[PDB]
């Protein structure tokens, strides 16, 4: 086993080897709750458990792409709810931008659409962004699908003025993958090639309850050490991988359980680089209050 | 089609008025035990997989298997003596499921508990499932021996400290609990083809649905039969539990304490007021020796 304890210290150990040279970035909606997003799936805090007011038929309809295209106010209610004042990335998405600086980030795959490993300074070559984004919204017609900036909709959002297409009155929506759309076609091929050379998996602030995306932790070589930092376990044993922190074959998998970003700062300052991390998300922090 | 008629504590209470709700099912799990300060496996922080460090195991799971256990007994007994609960007192949770009994609602309760705190909450023998045993009476290790101890016995060895031997073999004598590794009881598959076929109502409580197979029990379950669970959290996602998307249409999660669930339960069938009369009679009956 290329770690000598399954521990935060044995993963921090293996990131200064030679042969940990490409890690990827697993990322879910936790490691944005500190920048005031929540997550879908904490109970009381969750979306899921806040979704009354929008009179649904079911919790999951405000996600549903066919929903979505029969009654839109209720989505487009919540994007005007949920838009963040300051997109305002965390010390976890700076310390995937470490990563990145450092030469040791292959890729992050992200299920948010909230783009604050943009704004943490991670390129597009650097990102798969496995359910869309909200920075780019296109028409909904298979012969308009005319393209729309996010300053256009942000005003018709706020406006509450249902977005339509200007030349056809069709329905504009976000680049989000709803329930029932397909992946980018990138999440495939990037997964394809990325999951054939990585060294570490960094599973960050995820449940690991939506497909096809948590069966990635599973592509790996069986070598491959992953690390998760979150606040309870996730991806042991829907699933085809298995994170096995605790049984008596367990080799590889350790969970670091609690908030992303203090357990970003814990390994930043075992490898060396909490004075760094903390200087990086002060500058760029600092630097976004000036816009 | 819908048995309930909304996919909510409500909706569950008024399915358990109506005449069709005649037998109730509870599958309950260590969360229903920690009101009354056992704690979780699985909880982050407080449970027992994030509190194993002064038992230097190979493994988590090491302290629960029945390999280890036969090899490196001092640890578990080291848990045993630490975990003994000083007070043996049913939670709200227990009594709740007395209400059930003393109703006629309860069909079985079949538990992952070794605490025997339904046994006390007065549920008897036929309306249990002890499905990983219980720590209320041992046995001596080897096939050929299998000589029985009482608690008195256990508990002096435990609190002494003294791994307990059998007296005629000196082989290890182990409470009967269902160790990894180790067969559930007969009775558990014999009940369950039997209870599966008529159940009405599904209670999972306090349990995350995580250890097979007790999990695959709510697919025993008929389709049409509604399946609640009171929980800090969804767990258990025939079939498995669709609480929300656009097919979910006889699962209700209610999270939360399991004891304020119960007693949100009982209020909606109007039994809160005896339910805490019972749970304050019984405490009080308790410690009165
Ligand atoms: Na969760
Ligand atoms: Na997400
Ligand atoms: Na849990
Ligand atoms: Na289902
Ligand atoms: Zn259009
Ligand atoms: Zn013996």
Redesign the interface.
Known sequence: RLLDELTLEGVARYMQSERCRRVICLVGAGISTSAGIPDF?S??TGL??NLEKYHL?????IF?IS?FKKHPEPFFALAKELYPGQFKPTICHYFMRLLKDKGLLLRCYTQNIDTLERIAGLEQEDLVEAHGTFYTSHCVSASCRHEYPLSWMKEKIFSEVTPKCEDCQSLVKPDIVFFGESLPARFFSCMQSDFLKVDLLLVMGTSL?VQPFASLISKAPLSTPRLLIN???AG??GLGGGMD????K?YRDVAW?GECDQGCLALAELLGWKKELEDLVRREHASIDAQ
């Open positions: 799936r109970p009381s899921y458990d038929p079911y919790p999951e309809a549903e929903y309850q606040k309870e376990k042991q044993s922190f605790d049984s008596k367990a359980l």
